[PDB]
Design an enzyme around this catalytic site. Structure first.
Site, PDB file in Angstrom:
ATOM      1  N   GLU A 115       0.820  -1.205   0.000  1.00 24.02           N
ATOM      2  CA  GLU A 115       0.000   0.000   0.000  1.00 24.02           C
ATOM      3  C   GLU A 115       0.857   1.258   0.000  1.00 24.02           C
ATOM      4  O   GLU A 115       0.460   2.276  -0.581  1.00 24.02           O
ATOM      5  CB  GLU A 115      -0.952  -0.003   1.196  1.00 24.02           C
ATOM      6  CG  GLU A 115      -1.867  -1.211   1.272  1.00 24.02           C
ATOM      7  CD  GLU A 115      -3.006  -1.161   0.264  1.00 24.02           C
ATOM      8  OE1 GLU A 115      -2.967  -0.305  -0.645  1.00 24.02           O
ATOM      9  OE2 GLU A 115      -3.947  -1.978   0.382  1.00 24.02           O
ATOM     10  N   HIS A 118       1.621   2.159  -3.422  1.00 24.89           N
ATOM     11  CA  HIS A 118       0.483   2.868  -3.996  1.00 24.89           C
ATOM     12  C   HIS A 118       0.478   4.330  -3.568  1.00 24.89           C
ATOM     13  O   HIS A 118       0.234   5.223  -4.387  1.00 24.89           O
ATOM     14  CB  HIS A 118      -0.821   2.187  -3.590  1.00 24.89           C
ATOM     15  CG  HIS A 118      -0.916   0.756  -4.019  1.00 24.89           C
ATOM     16  ND1 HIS A 118      -1.970  -0.057  -3.662  1.00 24.89           N
ATOM     17  CD2 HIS A 118      -0.092  -0.008  -4.775  1.00 24.89           C
ATOM     18  CE1 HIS A 118      -1.791  -1.260  -4.178  1.00 24.89           C
ATOM     19  NE2 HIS A 118      -0.658  -1.256  -4.858  1.00 24.89           N
ATOM     20  N   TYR A 122       0.764   7.625  -6.186  1.00 24.47           N
ATOM     21  CA  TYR A 122      -0.130   8.775  -6.257  1.00 24.47           C
ATOM     22  C   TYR A 122       0.660  10.072  -6.197  1.00 24.47           C
ATOM     23  O   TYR A 122       0.311  11.051  -6.866  1.00 24.47           O
ATOM     24  CB  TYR A 122      -1.163   8.715  -5.136  1.00 24.47           C
ATOM     25  CG  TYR A 122      -2.084   7.526  -5.243  1.00 24.47           C
ATOM     26  CD1 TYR A 122      -2.613   7.145  -6.468  1.00 24.47           C
ATOM     27  CD2 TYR A 122      -2.411   6.770  -4.124  1.00 24.47           C
ATOM     28  CE1 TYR A 122      -3.455   6.054  -6.575  1.00 24.47           C
ATOM     29  CE2 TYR A 122      -3.248   5.675  -4.220  1.00 24.47           C
ATOM     30  CZ  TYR A 122      -3.768   5.322  -5.448  1.00 24.47           C
ATOM     31  OH  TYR A 122      -4.606   4.237  -5.551  1.00 24.47           O
ATOM     32  N   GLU A 204     -11.565  -2.066  -0.127  1.00 22.62           N
ATOM     33  CA  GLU A 204     -10.682  -2.519  -1.190  1.00 22.62           C
ATOM     34  C   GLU A 204     -11.409  -3.205  -2.338  1.00 22.62           C
ATOM     35  O   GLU A 204     -10.915  -3.176  -3.470  1.00 22.62           O
ATOM     36  CB  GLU A 204      -9.631  -3.471  -0.617  1.00 22.62           C
ATOM     37  CG  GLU A 204      -8.654  -2.801   0.331  1.00 22.62           C
ATOM     38  CD  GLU A 204      -7.453  -3.675   0.630  1.00 22.62           C
ATOM     39  OE1 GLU A 204      -6.310  -3.267   0.313  1.00 22.62           O
ATOM     40  OE2 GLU A 204      -7.661  -4.786   1.161  1.00 22.62           O
ATOM     41  N   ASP A 237      -2.530  -5.573  -7.503  1.00 22.60           N
ATOM     42  CA  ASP A 237      -2.335  -5.717  -6.065  1.00 22.60           C
ATOM     43  C   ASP A 237      -3.671  -5.720  -5.335  1.00 22.60           C
ATOM     44  O   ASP A 237      -3.898  -6.546  -4.444  1.00 22.60           O
ATOM     45  CB  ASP A 237      -1.443  -4.593  -5.542  1.00 22.60           C
ATOM     46  CG  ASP A 237      -0.037  -4.650  -6.103  1.00 22.60           C
ATOM     47  OD1 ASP A 237       0.358  -5.703  -6.649  1.00 22.60           O
ATOM     48  OD2 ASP A 237       0.676  -3.632  -5.995  1.00 22.60           O
ATOM     49  N   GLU A 238      -4.570  -4.807  -5.711  1.00 23.43           N
ATOM     50  CA  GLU A 238      -5.849  -4.673  -5.025  1.00 23.43           C
ATOM     51  C   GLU A 238      -6.697  -5.934  -5.133  1.00 23.43           C
ATOM     52  O   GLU A 238      -7.551  -6.168  -4.271  1.00 23.43           O
ATOM     53  CB  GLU A 238      -6.610  -3.461  -5.578  1.00 23.43           C
ATOM     54  CG  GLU A 238      -7.545  -2.775  -4.579  1.00 23.43           C
ATOM     55  CD  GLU A 238      -6.925  -2.620  -3.196  1.00 23.43           C
ATOM     56  OE1 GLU A 238      -6.234  -1.613  -2.929  1.00 23.43           O
ATOM     57  OE2 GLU A 238      -7.123  -3.524  -2.365  1.00 23.43           O
ATOM     58  N   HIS A 241      -5.429  -8.053  -2.306  1.00 25.56           N
ATOM     59  CA  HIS A 241      -5.790  -7.516  -1.000  1.00 25.56           C
ATOM     60  C   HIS A 241      -7.174  -7.981  -0.571  1.00 25.56           C
ATOM     61  O   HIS A 241      -7.352  -8.496   0.539  1.00 25.56           O
ATOM     62  CB  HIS A 241      -5.729  -5.992  -1.033  1.00 25.56           C
ATOM     63  CG  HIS A 241      -4.366  -5.441  -1.305  1.00 25.56           C
ATOM     64  ND1 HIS A 241      -4.119  -4.088  -1.393  1.00 25.56           N
ATOM     65  CD2 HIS A 241      -3.174  -6.055  -1.500  1.00 25.56           C
ATOM     66  CE1 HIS A 241      -2.836  -3.893  -1.639  1.00 25.56           C
ATOM     67  NE2 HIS A 241      -2.240  -5.071  -1.707  1.00 25.56           N
TER      68      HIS A 241
END
Ligand SMILES: Nc1ncnc2c1ncn2[C@H]1C[C@H](O)[C@@H](COP(=O)(O)OP(=O)(O)O)O1
Ligand SMILES: [Mg+2]
Lengths: 357, 149, 357
Positions: A115, A118, A122, A204, A237-238, A241
């Site tokens: 995370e 991530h 951003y 998520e 990735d999400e 998760h």
């Protein structure tokens, strides 16, 4: 009280996922639930860095957008930045003091680390499309449409931490703290964990995937294509998760891990349903804010709200909750591209003579 | 940016005009996507783009989405094409009276003049009651292209 | 009380490293201390996976070792597994609820994550040299020489976590909890943080480097070279880790980050000195257990203990502590390889006539 290295030698295979003896030795040759060991290996293989993606062409694409489409994109970015900001720290802070099996502890730390990548990406996108990143970042905390959901999401996290702290400091039982009575119930702690994991699952598996639609809808127009590559990596990735939170919730609810937990799951079945329903309504109202100044080719309030109803039914059914919306076909099928990544001349007249015309 | 309407006039580009049309053509159909048609159109907007070219692009897009998994695009693309063909001949969606049309067409030499010699205005208006122009909504896309072509 | 997303919009550049407002938005376009952002980028670039290392030749080398050299290696391996098991979770559990600037929060999670790969690599090495890894892992908890050393390191971690919980639940001040009086001092919490970081610095800059000598001493004889490749990758990470704790300790000690902290640093300077000296004294005692059954070519109890005294002086001076051992030259200089990366014929008689014999 929590110890970073418990002295007791325990068979880690017989420990529960949560609230058992704190993990001591981190070994990866065996697992009670191998789902988490497979998730670690897969997340380790997906390792990516944000700078390795070219996003410099996205600045031209962004400035060429209409002003209401700059709004759509930059609002979905601030919200993404906020969501994975909570997701950066919270799985470690809220779950590590509770995990009692090694394969799940390492997964949560791998999950939380992924995370932070991530969060960094951003920062990469923002500083490459806008002129002053401070404008975007400083608005995330004050923005009303995000803050409403930000404090709601963090509460399930904060409450689990708080109750966990009392459970470590005081132990189970009724206590007295400065004239006030404080009751520490492990059953209530297990209840706050389950409700938190359900909220994280909706975070998520619903909230972020609603956002994924906006990031990829620009990519379907061949716009913001550097962002899309990063968001596509995030979506990969999400997917891992939400699978983790799914297996945790299902292992708890089915009573495999903790017989008491199965009972607790049924007492919360109504709270979790309303929890998911609240999330879907929040994302719908969020869609109403995204397109308030206009829509774009391929995406409006209705299309996005339909995806909200679509993806919500899928996620809730995966965790054993009743579907709140009508059965619906996928309103944006194009998103699935991003979410899952010399003639034989011989003749026999005798054989033909075996024939009567 | 400006689009060029069918009647030559120009107005501000408004994507809601496109959502309206596609929502109409997809109503009742199962497993179709407004978003798919718009995105698969890859419609390149430029200042002064004709609104007729815009519609022909979303027809092609909706027509190429016909598949086993989404069979109902055969009617989405048909309803869009009928709507396009209505405007091509009449300037509007509503078809005119059978008599007013035949008179104009016989006058243009596109119909046989015997139509006016064998049927009276009272008879033509009686056959306009036979007509059900909503049966244009029962065609598949392949049917409409053979009609147009 | 700790919140996973603090509501207040704060200038993260002016917050302190610890005990300030918990981080809300994770941004990386600016840092108060760019040392940690540089540490993140470097740790992310050093990313390696254990399975990508050839260790198959190490099974044969290990089984060919003498019994006492099997002891040295497998004991130094168990100790490594224990140390990086604590380091996997503890920086996340003990520091994340206290960090108040984003670049340090992400570094701590990146730092802890890189430790989980070390834990996975130890499982990789162990399962590739021994027949039943359960034998090796189950001894770490029951072995007397290892378990004893666990309590010394985890205490500074456990004590900081417990006090951190009281400071979040109750806040600073004198309280009463179930008939007992409980005084929560932020100055004592800052004191417990500093002491914990000092122990972690001694763990990563002294204790682990003592282990590095043993892994590389086998490699200098072209034995266990698959292990050595991994340990060298770990040592490259371990260089970043001790650099992090050094910068934290020095920023705290100088009062640059928190003026109150400079005062507290001097009150602990004696505790920290005794903390480091004890750590060096403990690793000497550990060396006695490695070579109790015999030594090997290039390494014995004395050689390693000299390195303990050598490396301790370096690390303690780097954090502003007095040197406890005599000045010494590096007793194993070979370890530094692993830790960091036609005659011209012309004559002039007239020029010769310009000459008097
Ligand atoms: N301002 C605008 N911007 C973009 N598309 C438009 C528009 N106005 C109409 N359209 C779309 C809707 C129709 O699908 C297509 C042409 O349909 P129409 O209703 O026959 O054209 P018009 O409204 O220009 O007479 O163009
Ligand atoms: Mg029109």
């Amino acid at each position: 009280a929590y110890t970073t290295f418990s002295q007791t030698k325990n068979d880690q295979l017989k420990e529960p996922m949560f609230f058992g003896q704190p993990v001591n030795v981190a070994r990866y040759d065996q697992q009670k639930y191998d789902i988490f060991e497979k998730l670690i290996e897969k997340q380790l293989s997906f390792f990516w860095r944000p700078e390795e993606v070219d996003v410099s062409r996205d600045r031209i694409d962004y400035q060429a957008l209409p002003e209401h489409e700059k709004h759509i994109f930059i609002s979905n970015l601030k919200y993404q930045t906020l969501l994975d900001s909570i997701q950066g720290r919270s799985p470690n802070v809220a779950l590590l003091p509770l995990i009692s099996i090694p394969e799940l502890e390492t997964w949560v730390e791998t999950w939380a680390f992924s995370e932070t990548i991530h969060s960094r990406s951003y920062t990469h996108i923002i500083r490459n499309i806008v002129n002053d990143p401070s404008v975007v970042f400083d608005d995330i905390v004050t923005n009303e449409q995000i803050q409403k959901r930000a404090e709601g999401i963090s509460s399930y996290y904060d409450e689990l931490i708080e109750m966990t702290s009392y459970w470590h400091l005081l132990g189970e039982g009724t206590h007295t703290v400065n004239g006030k009575t404080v009751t520490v119930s492990l059953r209530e702690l297990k209840k706050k964990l389950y409700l938190c994991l359900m909220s994280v699952n909706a975070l998520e598996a619903i909230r972020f995937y609603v956002s994924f639609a906006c990031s990829f809808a620009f990519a379907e127009r061949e716009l913001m294509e550097g962002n899309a590559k990063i968001i596509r990596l995030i979506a990969r990735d999400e997917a891992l998760h939400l699978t983790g939170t799914q297996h945790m919730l299902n292992l708890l609810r089915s009573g495999a891990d903790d017989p008491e937990m199965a009972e607790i799951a049924e007492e919360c079945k109504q709270e979790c349903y309303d929890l998911f329903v609240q999330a879907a309504q929040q994302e719908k109202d969020w869609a109403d804010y995204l397109f308030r100044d206009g829509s774009m080719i391929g995406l409006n309030k209705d299309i996005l709200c339909q995806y909200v109803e679509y993806i919500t039914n899928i996620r809730m059914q995966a965790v054993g909750l009743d579907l709140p919306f009508q059965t619906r076909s996928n309103p944006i099928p194009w998103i699935n591209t991003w979410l899952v990544s010399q003639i034989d001349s011989e003749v026999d007249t005798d054989d033909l003579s075996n024939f009567q015309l | 940016l400006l689009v060029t309407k069918r009647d030559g006039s120009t107005e501000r580009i408004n994507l809601d005009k496109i959502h309206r049309v596609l929502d109409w053509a997809a109503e009742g159909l199962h497993n179709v996507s407004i978003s798919q048609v718009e995105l698969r159109s890859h419609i390149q907007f430029y200042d002064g783009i004709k609104t007729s070219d815009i519609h022909e692009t979303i027809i092609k897009a909706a027509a190429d989405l016909i598949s086993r998994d989404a069979p109902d695009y055969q009617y989405l693309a048909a309803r869009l094409a009928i709507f396009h063909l209505r405007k091509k001949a009449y300037g509007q969606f509503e078809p005119p009276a059978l008599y007013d049309h035949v008179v104009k067409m016989v006058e243009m030499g596109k119909y046989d003049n015997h139509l006016l010699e064998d049927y009276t205005e009272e008879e033509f208006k009686q056959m306009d009651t036979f007509i059900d122009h909503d049966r244009d909504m029962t065609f598949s896309y392949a049917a409409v292209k053979q009609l147009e072509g």
